[PDB]
């Protein structure tokens, strides 16, 4: 019973203590619905934290750290109970234990604590967890331990309100540059996810990632044999190409577009959608980057997904087509027209999603304004596939922007 466990765990006889702590750990590690609240309310937390101090009984340290790990794996309230019991400084102490298992379990507990949230993360950082954590990365580290270390790095990178301190990123990026060469799938997935969390933190963090020199090793993972690695890399590089034209060009210079045929035809529709999102962020760039998309022979696949893909992919494809018109040249838009973009691009004007409608209208207006002599031909193409009737119908749209743009389109190009 919990009363008996708590009483025996406060004993001065460390054998009885160890037995009681192991009983608590068993309760906490037998299934996926442990009685965390009952053990907390019984008053076992300060006892476990005190056990963490017993450098003369590494078994007791290990068992208490296991119990606290599983308590901290629960809700934010339970993790914060652990934190309020002052466990973090003692886990940091245990990071330097001469016993491997104690070190590992302390790393695991700190991982749960850090993963709770950004304020928790910042508290653990201010006490100096990063350098000792990264010191474990050596040729002799066991693979399971290294997987746990990389998971903790993920947790150190992932929250955004606020993002981790710049000093922390400067310490972590070299370790990620080391780990991105590992062939173990788990380590690689977590490394790339940590990178993706850094590249989603802002343009300055994007630039820190670029300056580390890791991007040429990250881009080729778009064609890794493991789909988890592929999608993690797609997230990270996509984040990068949400930035400036120069950062996007850093990505493109690593031959990123060569990896996308196998992603646009992938059986998984979510992957198609994410790849088209990436490419839409590419087509929003300068004429050279639009031309990089064109030369990669990706436009026909994009247009096919626009025509026949699932709705999500069609939305992303509409974004890509329209973004191409931002800085695209008249000959590039003419290539699009040649590839039969108008019929499906206009077909997407009848969906409930008002944002898609706005995007398609913006793209069509840019196409028409860009064409001087072709304008009449493009108008005829729009009318032939029924797009003009859809625009006339949109003239009566609820959304202010949509119907104003429809009126403008019709008045400037379909009213003479």
């Amino acid at each position: 019973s919990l009363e008996a466990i708590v009483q025996n765990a406060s004993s001065d006889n460390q054998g009885i203590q160890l037995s009681a702590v192991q009983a608590a750990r068993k309760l906490l590690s037998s299934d996926r619905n442990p009685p965390i609240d009952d053990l907390i309310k019984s008053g076992i937390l300060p006892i476990l934290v005190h056990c963490l101090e017993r450098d003369d009984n590494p078994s007791l340290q290990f068992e208490a750290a296991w119990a606290l790990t599983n308590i901290a794996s629960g809700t934010s309230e339970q993790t914060q109970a652990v934190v309020q019991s002052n466990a973090v400084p003692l886990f940091l102490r245990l990071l330097h234990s001469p016993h491997q298992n104690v070190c590992e379990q302390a790393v695991w507990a700190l991982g749960n604590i850090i993963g709770d949230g950004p304020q928790c993360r910042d508290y653990v950082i201010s006490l100096g967890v990063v350098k000792p954590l990264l010191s474990f990365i050596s040729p002799s580290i066991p693979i399971t331990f290294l997987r746990n270390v990389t998971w903790v790095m993920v947790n150190l990178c992932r929250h955004k309100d606020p993002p981790p301190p710049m000093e922390t990123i400067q310490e972590i990026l070299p370790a990620l540059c080391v780990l991105i060469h590992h062939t173990d799938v788990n380590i690689l997935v977590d490394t790339v996810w940590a990178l993706s969390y850094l590249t989603d933190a802002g343009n300055e963090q994007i630039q820190m990632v670029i300056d580390s020199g890791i991007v040429p090793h990250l881009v080729p993972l778009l064609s890794h044999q493991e789909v988890k690695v592929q999608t993690a890399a797609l997230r990270a590089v996509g984040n990068i190409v949400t930035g400036t034209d120069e950062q996007t060009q850093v990505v493109l210079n690593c031959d990123a577009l060569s990896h996308f045929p196998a992603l646009l035809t992938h059986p998984k529709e979510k992957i198609n959608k994410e790849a088209v999102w990436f490419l839409s962020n590419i087509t929003a760039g300068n004429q050279q980057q639009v031309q990089a998309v064109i030369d990669a022979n990706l436009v026909p696949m994009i247009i096919h997904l626009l025509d026949k893909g699932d709705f999500g992919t069609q939305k992303e494809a509409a974004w890509a087509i329209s973004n191409l018109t931002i800085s695209g040249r008249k000959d590039q838009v003419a290539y699009l027209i040649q590839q039969n973009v108008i019929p499906p691009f206009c077909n997407l004007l009848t969906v409930k999603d008002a944002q898609v409608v706005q995007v398609v209208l913006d793209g069509l207006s840019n196409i028409l304004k860009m064409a001087e002599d072709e304008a009449e031909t493009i108008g005829n193409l729009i009318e032939e596939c029924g797009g003009l009737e859809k625009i006339e119908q949109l003239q009566n749209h609820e959304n202010e922007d949509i119907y104003k743009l429809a009126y403008e389109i019709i008045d400037q190009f379909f009213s003479s």
Binding site: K26, L28, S29, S30, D31, R32, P34, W66, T69, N70, A72, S73, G74, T79, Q105, W108, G111, N112, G115, D116, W151, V154, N155, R158, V189, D190, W193, S196, D200, K228, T231, A232, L234, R235, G238, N239, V241, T242, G243, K270, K273, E274, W277, S280, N281, A284, G312, E316, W319, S322, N323, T325, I326, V359, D362, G363, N366
Partner: peptide, 26 residues
């Protein structure tokens, strides 16, 4: 308006968990 966009909701749903319990026999 047109332009670049950040990661959209629903994309990349298989992220690493923030918390892990150590379960006996797993």
């Amino acid at each position: 308006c047109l332009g670049r966009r950040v990661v959209q909701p629903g994309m990349f749903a298989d992220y690493p968990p923030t918390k892990k319990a150590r379960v006996l026999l797993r």
